[PDB]
Amino acid sequence: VKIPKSHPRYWSLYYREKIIEGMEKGMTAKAGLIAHGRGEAFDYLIGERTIEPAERAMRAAVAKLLLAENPVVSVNGNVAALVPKETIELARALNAKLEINLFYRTEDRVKAIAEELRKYDPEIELLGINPTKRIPGLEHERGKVDENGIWKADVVVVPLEDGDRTEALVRMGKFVITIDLNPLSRSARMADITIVDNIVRAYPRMTELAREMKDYSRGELIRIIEEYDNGKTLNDVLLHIRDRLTKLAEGGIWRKK
Amino acid sequence: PRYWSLYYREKIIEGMEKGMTAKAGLIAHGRGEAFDYLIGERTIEPAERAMRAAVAKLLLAENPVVSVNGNVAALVPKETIELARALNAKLEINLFYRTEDRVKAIAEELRKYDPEIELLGINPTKRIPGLEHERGKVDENGIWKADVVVVPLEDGDRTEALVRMGKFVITIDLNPLSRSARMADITIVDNIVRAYPRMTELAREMKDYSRGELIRIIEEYDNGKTLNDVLLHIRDRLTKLAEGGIWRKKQL
Ligand SMILES: Nc1ncnc2c1ncn2[C@@H]1O[C@H](COP(=O)(O)OP(=O)(O)OP(=O)(O)O)[C@@H](O)[C@H]1O
Ligand SMILES: Nc1ncnc2c1ncn2[C@@H]1O[C@H](COP(=O)(O)OP(=O)(O)OP(=O)(O)O)[C@@H](O)[C@H]1O
Ligand SMILES: [Mg+2]
């Protein structure tokens, strides 16, 4: 660990290392490294915390997940590098299935992800090891899915997802929840609930939420879901980024700080 | 067809396959994209403005050098050579994660589009003080003796250092708030894949201008105001996106 606990970018920097390792364990694609950067820049803009518009989406997503009939949490190379333990914990609290789901699928990459998750829960049912069914639209099996998971699923969480896949799953009729720091991504705009938070914070938080909201009665959960407006929430995120820009600038930019 | 975004993602990845571009550089590419999303993935007027002023400055320079790192080599090898010849400037390979293998990789990739181009920074012998040895190497006939350097996609410490050395520094950076963007004398907030073709085309035309008209452009240019204008662009844009809403819309 090449930097000090006092460092103002400590956590950011720590996760950069985690996604690098991820790659050289065979988990995270190169393309994923670019996506990690995309996330970094936007986190910095958002303020590297869980903003209210994100808290709001997460209350609603967890309620929707808890009322679901066959909820699946997806995993890919980035998630496996960054929050292997927390994704298991979240799937456990939801009693949701975990399905590995990649755009750059490989038996090798699939196996690296599996082994990494097993490190944390050797017992865990993993789906998408050998996926038979496929999503209408998409492409050369860059849209392959397991038949006992996302194929079957009414409600999916698809973190850090590609826009083609999010939009396609919606057209199937899946209720899609995404976690994505970029509110302007196609995936963010096409999801049913879009949580604009870093997944390193979103998952542990959704886990806390699920642990409290388990005790909520159905009607309570349905009130939350029915109140929720994903359009206003995205709009609130853009204006939040807008206002942090004018705050970061103030006192002038050029030379320097 | 988000074609070009994807096209350049492949280029940066091939960049690392070729040994030209480091892992950090892939993250950095992603950061760039994030800001390109905010700006609207085009060349806005304040970047057009900075690029004019930059090209003027470069055409009046005595010892102009355009610098190349792993990311620039992956994205615009062809165009970086064109820009240099059009400016009559030297080309220096200059990068943070310096490796003989990566330098060679970059050299060959540049030699593809111009086998007879002279490449500085193959074995630089001078250093910028106040950095590290491997962050800080500069070539005796290039950056060391330059009055004007173009350093795209640059670490803020190197930029600031070069300014400490009395170099007039021009940068291309999609992040208007970066250390490097704050420290440069002229900051072009644009995608390099856009900025370089554009500057090449500006150089060909502004060669026709009087020295006097170039000096005027140089002296009117205000990098502080220009960066504020890039933020105002961004803010008004987000304000307009929000008012209209974005959820479930195909194109923004
Ligand atoms: N640590 C993180 N926490 C949360 N989200 C992140 C993190 N790292 C990256 N992301 C987001 O995950 C997404 C990955 O999806 P992808 O790479 O397909 O984006 P895209 O191709 O630009 O958008 P689209 O495919 O929707 O047009 C990115 O939008 C990125 O911002
Ligand atoms: N295609 C591109 N066009 C223009 N600017 C880009 C492009 N890709 C990346 N950039 C910008 O180049 C800079 C990349 O440099 P980087 O952030 O890696 O250096 P650094 O600031 O020294 O490192 P760190 O930010 O981790 O301290 C970022 O500001 C990024 O926005
Ligand atoms: Mg930076």
Side-chain angles (χ1 to χ4, degrees), chain A residues 1-122 124-139 141 143-257, chain B residues 1-134 136-252:
Chain A
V1 73
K2 324 138 169 285
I3 71 289
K5 178 61 183 164
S6 62
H7 201 309
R9 291 302 132 210
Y10 176 85
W11 274 120
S12 178
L13 291 178
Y14 169 109
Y15 281 108
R16 219 186 264 220
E17 293 226 79
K18 289 304 205 161
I19 197 95
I20 310 281
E21 289 188 45
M23 199 199 49
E24 59 207 32
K25 292 192 187 176
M27 293 206 266
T28 154
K30 286 68 47 216
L33 254 59
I34 308 166
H36 186 79
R38 265 206 300 298
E40 221 177 58
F42 271 116
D43 209 8
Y44 166 80
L45 284 178
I46 288 296
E48 294 173 65
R49 63 188 178 82
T50 295
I51 62 165
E52 187 270 338
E55 197 63 55
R56 188 198 317 171
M58 280 188 283
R59 282 195 299 269
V62 168
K64 194 69 176 194
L65 286 154
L66 284 171
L67 284 188
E69 286 295 1
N70 304 287
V72 187
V73 175
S74 208
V75 191
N76 60 30
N78 280 65
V79 170
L82 290 172
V83 287
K85 176 168 160 208
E86 291 72 23
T87 176
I88 286 143
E89 280 188 3
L90 175 56
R92 255 163 212 302
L94 300 180
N95 193 43
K97 282 174 201 159
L98 217 46
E99 165 160 351
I100 307 173
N101 215 257
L102 310 163
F103 182 105
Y104 311 82
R105 192 152 187 111
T106 296
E107 194 207 317
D108 298 73
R109 169 169 297 125
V110 166
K111 186 182 136 190
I113 286 165
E115 284 177 41
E116 185 79 33
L117 270 28
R118 274 159 196 157
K119 182 133 41 119
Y120 284 101
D121 186 309
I124 184 56
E125 177 113 42
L126 300 182
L127 271 64
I129 315 279
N130 270 314
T132 72
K133 309 299 192 134
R134 306 216 319 181
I135 301 150
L138 297 191
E139 191 247 7
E141 338 234 294
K144 226 191 290 163
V145 293
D146 176 314
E147 98 180 333
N148 315 342
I150 293 186
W151 181 253
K152 187 171 174 208
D154 53 344
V155 180
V156 307
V157 187
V158 307
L160 284 65
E161 194 60 77
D162 185 72
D164 287 323
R165 204 126 82 116
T166 293
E167 175 164 5
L169 277 171
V170 185
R171 292 196 271 95
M172 289 198 69
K174 274 56 156 76
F175 195 95
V176 181
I177 298 158
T178 201
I179 293 112
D180 194 337
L181 280 157
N182 182 8
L184 306 166
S185 79
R186 162 84 136 225
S187 181
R189 306 205 301 284
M190 295 285 138
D192 285 281
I193 300 173
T194 303
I195 300 161
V196 189
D197 202 355
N198 194 310
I199 195 199
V200 169
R201 294 181 305 262
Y203 272 16
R205 184 65 193 136
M206 282 172 89
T207 293
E208 298 185 279
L209 284 172
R211 280 167 191 173
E212 168 173 298
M213 290 177 61
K214 262 157 135 184
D215 299 327
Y216 273 20
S217 55
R218 172 176 205 94
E220 281 168 301
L221 294 178
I222 271 143
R223 167 182 309 131
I224 293 160
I225 305 171
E226 294 191 346
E227 222 125 304
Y228 181 73
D229 187 329
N230 203 46
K232 179 191 140 58
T233 304
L234 285 167
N235 288 347
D236 284 347
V237 177
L238 306 171
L239 284 191
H240 170 82
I241 294 167
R242 158 162 93 28
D243 294 343
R244 254 189 58 78
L245 287 180
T246 115
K247 134 70 155 202
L248 284 166
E250 243 17 82
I253 308 147
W254 189 49
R255 308 257 168 96
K256 58 133 140 243
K257 263 203 284 276
Chain B
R2 309 203 60 253
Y3 171 67
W4 284 102
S5 155
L6 285 166
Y7 174 86
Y8 287 109
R9 258 176 229 178
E10 321 310 309
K11 292 310 215 215
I12 207 90
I13 292 166
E14 289 168 19
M16 177 185 163
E17 282 156 8
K18 268 129 146 200
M20 280 183 315
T21 122
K23 282 149 183 132
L26 263 51
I27 309 179
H29 186 76
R31 291 216 288 295
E33 292 183 327
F35 288 89
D36 218 5
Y37 272 106
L38 288 186
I39 274 138
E41 291 173 26
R42 67 184 180 92
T43 292
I44 60 164
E45 181 273 335
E48 189 58 54
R49 182 197 314 173
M51 275 188 288
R52 259 234 310 185
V55 169
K57 190 82 192 182
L58 286 153
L59 288 173
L60 301 203
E62 301 297 342
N63 284 105
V65 181
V66 324
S67 186
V68 171
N69 52 48
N71 279 54
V72 176
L75 284 189
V76 285
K78 192 156 167 327
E79 292 71 20
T80 183
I81 296 160
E82 274 156 0
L83 179 53
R85 278 161 170 332
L87 291 178
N88 193 18
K90 316 212 223 177
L91 206 54
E92 195 167 325
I93 291 173
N94 203 293
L95 68 126
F96 10 118
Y97 270 112
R98 209 182 141 73
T99 277
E100 302 120 1
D101 292 83
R102 187 168 287 137
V103 168
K104 186 178 176 261
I106 280 155
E108 291 171 18
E109 179 78 28
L110 291 167
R111 261 146 202 165
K112 283 189 40 180
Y113 303 87
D114 189 328
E116 26 206 292
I117 197 81
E118 200 209 56
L119 303 170
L120 270 15
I122 308 278
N123 269 113
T125 48
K126 297 302 217 208
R127 328 177 328 96
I128 310 147
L131 293 133
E132 1 236 46
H133 206 252
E134 279 294 80
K137 289 181 181 211
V138 299
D139 187 299
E140 188 167 350
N141 317 308
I143 289 164
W144 183 260
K145 57 190 286 289
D147 58 332
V148 183
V149 313
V150 184
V151 295
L153 279 60
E154 188 52 271
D155 305 358
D157 43 353
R158 253 148 69 130
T159 295
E160 184 176 331
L162 288 166
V163 174
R164 295 205 118 62
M165 276 172 73
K167 313 304 170 190
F168 187 101
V169 173
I170 297 151
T171 200
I172 289 103
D173 197 312
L174 274 159
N175 178 4
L177 300 177
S178 67
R179 212 174 137 197
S180 172
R182 285 158 181 288
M183 288 294 92
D185 297 277
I186 294 176
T187 312
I188 290 154
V189 193
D190 201 12
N191 208 311
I192 185 156
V193 306
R194 298 194 294 272
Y196 265 27
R198 182 64 174 139
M199 293 169 62
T200 296
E201 165 61 24
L202 285 175
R204 278 148 191 185
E205 182 246 344
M206 280 167 89
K207 279 177 217 210
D208 283 351
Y209 288 25
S210 62
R211 203 183 176 78
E213 228 300 91
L214 291 176
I215 284 159
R216 201 208 57 155
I217 282 156
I218 282 155
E219 261 167 21
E220 298 173 357
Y221 180 66
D222 181 341
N223 208 37
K225 150 115 149 71
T226 283
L227 285 166
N228 299 342
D229 291 342
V230 161
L231 290 163
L232 221 169
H233 165 77
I234 295 187
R235 316 220 239 85
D236 300 349
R237 171 140 193 281
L238 284 169
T239 300
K240 176 151 177 226
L241 289 174
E243 145 105 90
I246 54 169
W247 184 44
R248 296 300 206 207
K249 299 214 176 130
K250 262 139 190 221
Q251 46 130 209
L252 290 175

PDB file of all heavy atoms in Angstrom, chain B residues 31 154 156 173 175 178-179, ligand 3:
ATOM      1  N   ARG B  31     -11.330   8.693 -17.348  1.00  0.00           N
ATOM      2  CA  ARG B  31     -11.485  10.033 -16.807  1.00  0.00           C
ATOM      3  C   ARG B  31     -11.745  11.080 -17.882  1.00  0.00           C
ATOM      4  O   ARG B  31     -12.587  11.952 -17.720  1.00  0.00           O
ATOM      5  CB  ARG B  31     -10.215  10.410 -16.021  1.00  0.00           C
ATOM      6  CG  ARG B  31     -10.025   9.610 -14.734  1.00  0.00           C
ATOM      7  CD  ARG B  31      -9.410  10.449 -13.612  1.00  0.00           C
ATOM      8  NE  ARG B  31      -8.003  10.723 -13.879  1.00  0.00           N
ATOM      9  CZ  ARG B  31      -7.047   9.792 -13.923  1.00  0.00           C
ATOM     10  NH1 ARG B  31      -7.315   8.546 -13.543  1.00  0.00           N
ATOM     11  NH2 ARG B  31      -5.803  10.116 -14.291  1.00  0.00           N
ATOM     12  N   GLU B 154      -1.357  15.561 -19.323  1.00  0.00           N
ATOM     13  CA  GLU B 154      -0.114  15.633 -18.567  1.00  0.00           C
ATOM     14  C   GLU B 154      -0.423  15.562 -17.073  1.00  0.00           C
ATOM     15  O   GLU B 154      -1.487  16.014 -16.631  1.00  0.00           O
ATOM     16  CB  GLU B 154       0.639  16.931 -18.899  1.00  0.00           C
ATOM     17  CG  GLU B 154       2.043  17.018 -18.311  1.00  0.00           C
ATOM     18  CD  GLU B 154       2.886  15.800 -18.644  1.00  0.00           C
ATOM     19  OE1 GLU B 154       2.848  14.815 -17.877  1.00  0.00           O
ATOM     20  OE2 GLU B 154       3.580  15.824 -19.680  1.00  0.00           O
ATOM     21  N   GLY B 156      -0.073  17.000 -13.445  1.00  0.00           N
ATOM     22  CA  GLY B 156       0.054  18.392 -13.001  1.00  0.00           C
ATOM     23  C   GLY B 156       1.425  18.783 -12.471  1.00  0.00           C
ATOM     24  O   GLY B 156       1.810  19.949 -12.537  1.00  0.00           O
ATOM     25  N   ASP B 173      -6.465  19.035 -22.260  1.00  0.00           N
ATOM     26  CA  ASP B 173      -6.980  18.296 -21.120  1.00  0.00           C
ATOM     27  C   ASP B 173      -8.482  18.469 -21.036  1.00  0.00           C
ATOM     28  O   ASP B 173      -8.975  19.592 -20.887  1.00  0.00           O
ATOM     29  CB  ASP B 173      -6.349  18.821 -19.832  1.00  0.00           C
ATOM     30  CG  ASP B 173      -6.507  17.856 -18.669  1.00  0.00           C
ATOM     31  OD1 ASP B 173      -7.643  17.371 -18.463  1.00  0.00           O
ATOM     32  OD2 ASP B 173      -5.524  17.664 -17.905  1.00  0.00           O
ATOM     33  N   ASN B 175     -10.248  17.814 -18.584  1.00  0.00           N
ATOM     34  CA  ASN B 175     -10.649  18.236 -17.260  1.00  0.00           C
ATOM     35  C   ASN B 175     -10.165  19.651 -16.934  1.00  0.00           C
ATOM     36  O   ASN B 175      -9.027  19.844 -16.514  1.00  0.00           O
ATOM     37  CB  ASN B 175     -10.177  17.255 -16.187  1.00  0.00           C
ATOM     38  CG  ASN B 175     -10.554  17.716 -14.772  1.00  0.00           C
ATOM     39  OD1 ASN B 175     -11.239  18.732 -14.602  1.00  0.00           O
ATOM     40  ND2 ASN B 175      -9.938  17.112 -13.779  1.00  0.00           N
ATOM     41  N   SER B 178      -8.265  20.265 -13.570  1.00  0.00           N
ATOM     42  CA  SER B 178      -7.068  19.519 -13.203  1.00  0.00           C
ATOM     43  C   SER B 178      -5.943  20.461 -12.791  1.00  0.00           C
ATOM     44  O   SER B 178      -5.891  21.631 -13.200  1.00  0.00           O
ATOM     45  CB  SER B 178      -6.595  18.619 -14.340  1.00  0.00           C
ATOM     46  OG  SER B 178      -6.126  19.375 -15.446  1.00  0.00           O
ATOM     47  N   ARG B 179      -4.986  19.899 -12.074  1.00  0.00           N
ATOM     48  CA  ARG B 179      -3.790  20.626 -11.691  1.00  0.00           C
ATOM     49  C   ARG B 179      -3.103  21.121 -12.956  1.00  0.00           C
ATOM     50  O   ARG B 179      -2.685  22.276 -13.048  1.00  0.00           O
ATOM     51  CB  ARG B 179      -2.847  19.705 -10.903  1.00  0.00           C
ATOM     52  CG  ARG B 179      -2.007  20.402  -9.842  1.00  0.00           C
ATOM     53  CD  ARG B 179      -1.207  19.396  -9.017  1.00  0.00           C
ATOM     54  NE  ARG B 179       0.174  19.828  -8.785  1.00  0.00           N
ATOM     55  CZ  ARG B 179       1.157  19.022  -8.386  1.00  0.00           C
ATOM     56  NH1 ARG B 179       0.931  17.730  -8.175  1.00  0.00           N
ATOM     57  NH2 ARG B 179       2.372  19.514  -8.183  1.00  0.00           N
TER      58      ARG B 179
HETATM   59 MG    MG C   3      -5.501  14.500 -12.987  1.00  0.00          MG
END
